[PDB]
Every structure is written in structure tokens, then in C-alpha cells.
Structure 1
Amino acid sequence: NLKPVDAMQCFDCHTQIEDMHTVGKHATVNCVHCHDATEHVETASSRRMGERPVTRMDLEACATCHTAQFNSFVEVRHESHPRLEKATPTSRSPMFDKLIAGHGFAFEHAEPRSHAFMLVDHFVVDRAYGGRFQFKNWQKVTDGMGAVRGAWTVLTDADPESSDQRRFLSQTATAANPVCLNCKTQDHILDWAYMGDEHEAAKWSRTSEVVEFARDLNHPLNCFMCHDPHSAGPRVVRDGLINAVVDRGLGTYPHDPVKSEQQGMTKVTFQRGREDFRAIGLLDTADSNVMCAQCHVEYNCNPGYQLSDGSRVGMDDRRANHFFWANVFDYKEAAQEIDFFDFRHATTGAALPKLQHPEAETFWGSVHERNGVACADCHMPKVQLENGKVYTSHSQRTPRDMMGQACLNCHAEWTEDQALYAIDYIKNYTHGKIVKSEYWLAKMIDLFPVAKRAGVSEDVLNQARELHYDAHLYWEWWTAENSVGFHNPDQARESLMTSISKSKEAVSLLNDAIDAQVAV
């Protein structure tokens, strides 16, 4: 059984924690629930850690007093089809392989599934670790509870004796790097300096051997990612988000200074010795838009190249951990600001951005966001009980599973079927424009080899490559973004028509240039 420790004694040296702990709703929650500091207290001074105390990062540390939130979080949504590759005719991006050729996502890019699996899925996807990690067997793919208990309880490493990223199967890539893990887990929250910068007190950083880092990480989506364990108050911990919102002064709602001020973030820094080491962002309100924006954003979490001179931007560069914190129409400028692109298309040679699930930046300015609706309202609503204590569902999933709570309480004028029909109208229309955007991008892409071989000039090819960047951005945003337009249907529409416009411009340019070469 746990025995409480003298918190007051801890506070003689931990005044920041004292100020958080004594004021919030965890004021009565003893440190022993999440720390083992016996040897630490015997050896520390206010200026010397002494023995490092243990800090529990497991979600069970919270589940004893918050079982409903834990259980609704770990629940597996079996209808969220697993390991479902998006590059197929029946999924999000039928022409993804042609369009993304040159990028690691060509090796595999599945639809998301339940949050319980985020860390294990990161480890086993074919693009991440060369196929080094697998579930112990194909049955373990069901075990959300096991994955939450710890990735290494359900995974195997093909070669525990080596730590290098390499291919273990031919059609894999080794795209994983330490920055990725920040959106899968925060088990390393005390071992990783802000942004993943080199730091004397950081075991891990952007430049770590990601296989070694991986082995040290266990739990998905730690409960403390959104809730300070000391104050119990709302926060974020993701460095790239705090960087965009606070360091870069972009605010929580870059398009709304008022809402940014009402629903803002306060950066709190923790030191190691005299030196700033890590930071959190306390939220003014329990704002799930910003909590979910820790991961559901477009980001760099990878090396890339400079737009200016094409040179490598490696993991050591701060730009390898970056939240652009920009809507689709501001993204190109945001990428130009940091002088960065992700990859060169394998066929066209164009410098291209790689977009990832920009749900947060898409949601801005949408009708629901402007009306003060937030991610949680549709994806983790309060539970409705005929008789019971209300709590907030932590099963973060499509509102189709809980339409009464997620939609119909607000939309009293609709039945469930009507609300689903409204969702489907948007997704159907958006998906048709995605598919047409791909058709046109693919038509352009296929002209590049013809053009090159016909002797079309580099100047014309470069003009087309510039158009490719735009056509790509304005399409990929929407295959990357998970709502298929629902989060901002007018923006999706405008962007995808822009994509098609750009591709058509490039097609015309190339066909005319090819035709002129032939005519010579």
C-alpha cells in the first residue's frame, strides 16, 4: 500500500511545484502517487538533485482515482479500421503513391486508429524503423490495454543488440526520429529539453539514436499531456506548440487576438541547475482546441532541405521540430519564413512540402470554431446519464458514435440521420475534389518525364515545379487533414480548387512546351 510522504518537506526545495500543487484540485493528492523520492530526499539539497527520484509516467497513476476517464480513453474503437493504407482506391488518397513518390510515406501511411495504439503504431509502421519493431504476433494488434500498459509489453525488436536505424524488410523506411515521439508519448518529459535542443540535463534530444530512445518509451498519450499533475489544471506540454503560441507570439488563435487573450497559454519553465530545461503551457481555460493541437497539427518532425539553396536541414536544426501554426493559405509563407521544404518529388524533382493532419489550423475560422465549439465538444463530449455523476468521455473518436452528445444537443432541429447526412454531404463533396485534385496532379506528374525526354528546358520544368509545390500543398492538406473537409468545408473547397487550378496551369505549360519541342 502507498504511504504518504511529507510534501511540506519537498516544498522546502520545490517552490514552483508548491505553488501549483497547493492551489489546485490535487492539493490533497500526495506525491507518493507519482513519485518515489525517498533516496532523493535523503541526498538532495536545494541546489543538488542527489539521487534522482522516480517519476511515474504510466496512465495507471491517474486511473486509480479517475477510472472513468482512463477507461474511456483506453477503449478500442474496433470500427476504426486498423492498418488501413490510405494509398488505395477505397481510402483517402487513391493516387497517394504517385503524388508522394520521394517521401517516406510512400512506404506506408495508414488511417489513424484509437489513441491507445499511437505509440505502438508509430513503432511498427513500415515507414518508421525499417520494420525493426513488430507486435509480438498478429493477435496483439487488438490489445489497446496492453499497448497503454507499455509498448514493449506488446512489441518485439528484431535486433535488441543494435541501435542503428536500418531496413529489416525491403519495403520499409527509417523516417522515425526523436521528434516524432513527442506526439506519441511524454514518458520522456523529464529527459528531453525544450524543443529537443542539446542540453546537459537531457538524456534525449533531436539528435539521439531514435532506436535507443524508442526502447525507453512505453506509454501513449500520457494523461498529464493535457492536465498538470500538480495543479490538475489544463495545460499543454508539447514544446513545438508552446514555441508557436508563446515564443513566436502567434497566440492560441492566431486569427483571433481576443480569443487568444481569453483562452491563452502561460509558459512555465523548469530549470536544471541554473539553466532553463523544459516548459509547459498552462491554459487559461480547459480549451481542448489547444490541448488537441499538441499533436493534431501540421509540423516538421523530420529533416528537410532549404528552399533557398536546397541544403540539408538535419535533426540538429531547430527547424526539425516545428509547428507552423498556419492555415493552408498561410502555410507557404510559414515554410518560406523558416526556409524549409520536406522532399523532392521522385518524378518531377519539385521541392515539396509534406503535410500532416492539420486539424487545429483547419478548424480556425470555421463556423463551429467561430461559435466557440472545440474539439472535445464533438470528439470527447460529456457523458449523458439518466442517473449519475457526469464526467468527460476520453474516448476521442468520431462523433458518429455519440451523435446525441456530440451534435444533436446543439442541433435540436436535426435527427441523427440528418446530422450524418450533413456530415456526408461535406465529406462526399470534399473527397470528390480531393480525387479530382489527384487526377490533375497525376496528369501533371506524368508529363514531367515526357517533357524532360522531349527536351523541355529546365526553366520550363522549374516553372512547373513551382506550380507543383502549390498544387501539392493545396491538395495534400486535405488528405492529411482527417475530417475530409468537415472541419472547414469552404476552406477545403477553395484550397482544392486552387490545387486543381495550379495543376491545370502546369499541365498546360508542359503540354505546350512538349508540343513546341516536337514541332521543332
Structure 2
Amino acid sequence: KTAHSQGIEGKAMSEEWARYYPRQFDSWKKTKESDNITDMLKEKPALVVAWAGYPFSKDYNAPRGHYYALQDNINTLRTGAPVDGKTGPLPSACWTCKSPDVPRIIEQDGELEYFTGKWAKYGDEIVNTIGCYNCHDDKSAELKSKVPYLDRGLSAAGFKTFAESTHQEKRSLVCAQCHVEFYFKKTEWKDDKGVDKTAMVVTLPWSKGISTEQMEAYYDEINFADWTHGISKTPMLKAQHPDWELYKTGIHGQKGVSCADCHMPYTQEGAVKYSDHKVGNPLDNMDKSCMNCHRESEQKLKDIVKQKFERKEFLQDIAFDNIGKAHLETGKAMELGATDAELKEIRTHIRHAQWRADMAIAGHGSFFHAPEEVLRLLASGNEEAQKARIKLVKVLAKYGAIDYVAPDFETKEKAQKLAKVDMEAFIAEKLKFKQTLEQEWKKQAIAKGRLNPESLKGVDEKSSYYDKTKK
């Protein structure tokens, strides 16, 4: 039994746990060290074309430390510039995987209420970043999943629920609360006051299983689209960081190595074992993360991982080049008068191409967690894109444009022009929001005692559109 067996007052604030667990608190805070903003649209402008019509064509950066999760959720151009709790582009579900205030609010408002309304609804309540309470019971300190959709997905896929799982399984499932592919299911409900409401509920598309193809079948069966492509008008699916799903296809996952084994390695100090809570790049800490199971040098292992990254990059660039061209060629065919009927098969190929390729690349560790599945997925996605392009030549020819050359999209700026993203306008609007409503949110949360200003140190120095140069 713990020193906090009746629970922790202010449990959503990780600082409240520090008195009991100073070591884990200290290492947990060190994800502040991982402050790099890598603008993935700048690095891979083909993604802008892939995501035309979708917020990821505005702003999409690589992950950084958990310390920044909440602030990055606020800063991303994807969440736009609300003026109040009823405005802004995105729904309340966007907080879900960013904050320990999420289970706090779910446990208080209920899941459906939590999932009802705009992201801006909770701006002055959801103010702590990924914290102890996202993964731990505040009485027993045991690992817990705090979000109902995970068990729902696990059960749908025929897996054991969190509670039914082994400890070693839980050491990955706590991560899978967030590091999974999801969609928002529009969910009609009626509250305690009999008011009809609409929730957008985080849902794991796992009822046919957790392979990319099973999820593709799932989404096709329900005719789901995350958006209609801004160039090709294809019904598109967006993959989001299927880190756990793909990790399950990989040899380490198959062998029962948990996320925590690599990302939260143990340090043994006499009779006491401590987990490193600085969740980051295991390659920064290889003696602890890798070398308990692997012999021979760190450099050789690093070199092998680099080769995996390079193979993935090679296939990713091919697949997304063909995907981008297919979108653009479809847009051209549309401009010339090609009908939806004439483009239907093409669009299905593009949807599947991009679903598979996005699923391969959307988990930034998948190239390592499941290298062979990632390569197969990129190859499969590229094949679908090329089938679309072969069919597109014929449609273009029918409309007198067989010699059409899809425009180049080799810089973010050129790609964003093709995707009709006025990023300057979005940035200007965003800055106004940050300078006004965001600061009101933080001021109110501090006044109410939901937010400790200590947690804000260095948290808002960088985004894809500013860098105060300090983080």
C-alpha cells in the first residue's frame, strides 16, 4: 500500500505526486529536454498534397517530449483560433491524449459530455500536460488505462482488456491509450437534462483486428472518410500514429518486449528498481534501453537502425510522390470534366494507397518497431497509387490531356499553394488567439488552481511558425 492510499488531492497535477515519488517526477519532467520542432511538411512536402483539404496540410510536426504535448496541441495551426468556447475548427476530442485533466474531466462530466463540443470548450480546464494521472491510479499507483476507448478497442479486436492483461502487457497498453490510430465517431446522445447532444468520440477502428488492412476493411465497411480530398475529392482516411498497432506486428512486440522496456528502462539501485520516466529516444540511452538484450556495440546497433530509417525513407518518398501525383492528376481530370463514375476506381485506389502509406509512416518509430511491415505497407500503398495513375492516364487521354505533367510539390510553399493553404492567414489568426484567449485560459486556470505556472516554464518557446530561440 502507498503513502497516498486514499488518493491524491489535485491528482491531475503531476506536481502533486512529487511528494511521494520525487525520482519518477524528476525524470518525467525531463521530457522538457526534447524540445525540437521538426516541421514535417517542410521535410516532406508531399504530405501537404496528401493532406490537402485536411488540417495536417497546415501544420504537422514530429513528436517531441511529453512536456510539450498540451502546449503543442494549443499551438498547432490545426486547432486554429477560437474566440470563445464555441468556436475553432476542432472538437473537444483533441485534448484527449494530451493531458491528465482529460480523465479528470471524463470522471466528472462523463465520457459523452467530455466528447461534446469544441476543443475551445475546455481551454481553461485542460491545462496540464501528459502526467502521472494519465497512467497511474492515484491510490495504488498501479498502471491504469484512464480512457474508456482503449478497452473498447481491445475487446473489439479480441484482445484482453487492460485489467485482464499481464503486467508486461500493461507496460505497453498504458502507452496505447494515446499511441494508437483512431477516428472520431459522431455519437448522438441525450444528457441528464434530456438535451439532445452530439459527441465526437475517440474510437479505435479495431473491430476487424489491428492490421492496416483490417482497419481499412473496417473503414470501408462503414464508408468512413476523415475528409474529402481538396484536390482529388477522394474520400480519404487519415492514419494517426498507429504506434502500438504496428509495434504488435514487429519482432520486439511479438517477443513480448514492451514499450516501457525500451522507452522507460529500469535502473537498479540495490533492492530498489526505478523506471526512467524521461520518455524519449531510446537510442540516446542505449546501454539501458538496448544492451540488456543485445551484445556488440551501440554504434553497430545505431547503424542498423539508421539503415532501417533509410529504407523507409526511400519507399516513403516513392509512395508519396505517386500518391501526390495521383491526387493532382485526378484534380486535372476533374478540371477537364471527368465524372465521379469515371474516377471512382481511381479514388478508391488513392484512398487505399494513402491509408496504407500513411499507416506506415504516421508512427514515427514504426520503421524500427515493425520494419518489415512498414516496408510492405509502403510497397502496397505505392502499388495502389500506381494502379490509380495507370488508370488516370486513360482518363486524362479521354479528355485530351495525356501529356499532362502533374505540378511539382518539392517545397512546402509550392505544395501548400497547390493545396490552397493560406498559412500566413492561419498564422496571423493563431497568434491573435494565443495573445488573447489562450492567455485568458491560462490565467483562469491558474486562478482556479488547475494550473501551476511552474509547468509553463519554457513550454511555449517554439512552434512550426515561431521560435523564441530558448526552449
TM-score range, shorter chain: 0.7 to 0.9
Bigger relative contact order (CA 8 A; separation at least 6): 2
Partner of 2:85: 163
2-structure distance, mates of 1:498, 1:194: 45
Using the TM superposition, give the Cα deviation of residue 340 of structure 1 relative to its aligned residue in structure 2, in angstroms.
2.0
Say which SS state the counterpart of residue 139 (structure 2) adopts: coil
Once the two structures are superposed, what CA deviation does each residue of 1:328-368 show, in whole Å capped at 9, x if it has no partner? 12111222354421000001000001110000000113111
Which residue does 1:67 correspond to in 2? Answer: 22
Q: Label 1:498 to 1:360 Cα distance change in 2 as closer, same or farther (>3 A).
A: same
Q: Structure 1 residue 185: deviation in Å?
A: 1.3
**Residues 390-441 of structure 1: CA deviation (Å, up to 9, x unaligned):** 30000111111111111122111x2000110111111110111111101111
Whether the 8 Å contact between 1:87 and 1:94 is mirrored in structure 2 is: yes
The answer on whether the counterparts of 1:236 and 1:283 sit within 8 Å (CA) in structure 2 is: no
1:236 paired residue number: 145
> Do residues 505 (structure 1) and 387 (structure 2) align?
yes
Q: Distance in 1 between matches of 2:300 and 2:234?
A: 44
For structure 1, which runs of at least 5 residues remain unmatched after alignment? 1-24, 36-54, 133-158, 167-173, 199-203, 253-259, 267-281, 305-313
Q: Which amino acid is the alignment partner of residue 39 of structure 2?
A: E
Relative to structure 1, is the Cα distance of residues 477 and 195 closer, same or farther in structure 2, using a 3 angstrom cutoff? farther
2:179 maps to 1:265: no
Residue number among 224, 229, 236 corresponding to 1:345 in the alignment: 229
Distance 1:418 1:396, change over 3 A: same
- Alignment map for 1:214-363 (pairs within 5 Å): 214-246=123-155, 248=156, 250-252=157-159, 260=160, 264-266=161-163, 283-286=165-168, 287-301=170-184, 316-317=198-199, 320-325=201-206, 326-363=210-247
Counterpart of 1:182 (choices 96, 106, 111) is 96
Judged with a 3 Å threshold, the aligned counterparts in structure 2 of structure 1 residues 194 and 321 are, in CA distance, closer, same or farther, namely farther
Give the match for residue 8 of structure 2. 34
The residue correspondences of 1:108-507 to structure 2 (distance < 5 A) are: 108-130=59-81, 162-166=84-88, 174-175=89-90, 177-192=91-106, 197-198=111-112, 204-246=113-155, 248=156, 250-252=157-159, 260=160, 264-266=161-163, 283-286=165-168, 287-301=170-184, 316-317=198-199, 320-325=201-206, 326-383=210-267, 389-412=272-295, 414-507=296-389
Is the 2:184–2:202 Cα contact (8 Å) retained in structure 1?
yes
Aligned counterparts of 2:332 and 2:230: Cα–Cα separation in 1: 14
CA apart distance, 1:245: 1.8
**Inter-partner Cα distance in structure 1 for 2:202 and 2:238:** 14
Q: 1:193 to 1:316 in 2, by over 3 A?
A: farther
CA deviation profile, 1:265-303 (whole Å, cap 9, x unmatched): 23xxxxxxxxxxxxxxx7541522111000000011476
Distance in structure 1 (CA, Å) of the matches to 2:137 and 2:238: 32
Distance change in 2, residues 1:81/1:402 (3 Å): same
Q: 1:346 aligns to what SS in structure 2?
A: coil
> Which structure features the higher share of helix residues?
2
Return the alpha-carbon distance in structure 1 between the equivalents of residues 232 and 150 of structure 2. 33
Q: 1:476 to 1:315 in 2, by over 3 A?
A: farther
* 2: CA distance, partners of 1:193 / 1:334: 30
Query: Which residue in the other structure is 1:87 paired with?
Result: 41
Q: Distance in 2 between matches of 1:192 and 1:508?
A: 49
Q: What is the Cα deviation at residue 516 of structure 1?
A: 3.1
The one-letter amino acid of 2:85's match is S
**Secondary structure in 1 aligned to 2:79?**
coil
Partner of 1:141: none
Q: CA deviation at 1:451?
A: 1.7
Count of paired positions: 390
Counterpart of 1:218, as a letter, is V
Structure 1 residues 417, 445: closer, same or farther in 2, change over 3 A? same
Letter paired with 1:105: F
Question: 2-side partners of 1:195 and 1:350: how far apart?
Answer: 37
Unmatched runs of 5 consecutive residues or more in structure 2: 188-195, 403-471
RMSD of the alignment, in Å?
2.6
1:104 aligns with 2:61: no
In 1: Cα distance, 2:45 partner to 2:395 partner: 29
Provide the identity percentage.
21
- 2:12 equivalent to 1:57: yes
Q: Structure 2: how far apart are the matches of 1:197 and 1:57? A: 17
The alignment partner of 1:518 has SS state of: coil
Q: 8 Å contact 1:194–1:239 — kept in the other structure?
A: no
Calculate the TM-score normalised by the size of structure 2. Answer: 0.77
Going from structure 1 to structure 2, the CA distance change for 1:436 and 1:403 (only over 3 Å counts) comes to: same
TM-score, length of structure 1 as denominator length: 0.70
> What secondary structure sits across from 2:357 in the alignment?
helix
What is the identity, as a one-letter code, of the residue corresponding to 2:80?
A: Y
Distance 1:124 1:221, change over 3 A: same
1:76 paired to 2:31 = yes
CA contact (8 A) 2:103 2:134 kept: no
| Contact kept? 1:430, 1:484, Cα under 8 Å | no
Answer with 226-235 or 65-74: which moved more.
226-235
Structure 2 distance, partners of 1:70, 1:498, is 43
Within 2, Cα distance between the matches of 1:80 and 1:185? 18
Superposed CA offset, 1:62-117 (max 9, x none): 111111111111113545512x21112xx3x3311111001011111111110011
Mapped contact 2:226–2:237 kept (Cα < 8 A) = yes
Letter in 1 for 2:230: A
Q: Deviations over 1:151-209 (max 9, x none)?
A: xxxxxxxx6xx33324xxxxxxx22x2112121113243432699654xxxxx422234
Change beyond 3 A, Cα 1:188–1:226: closer
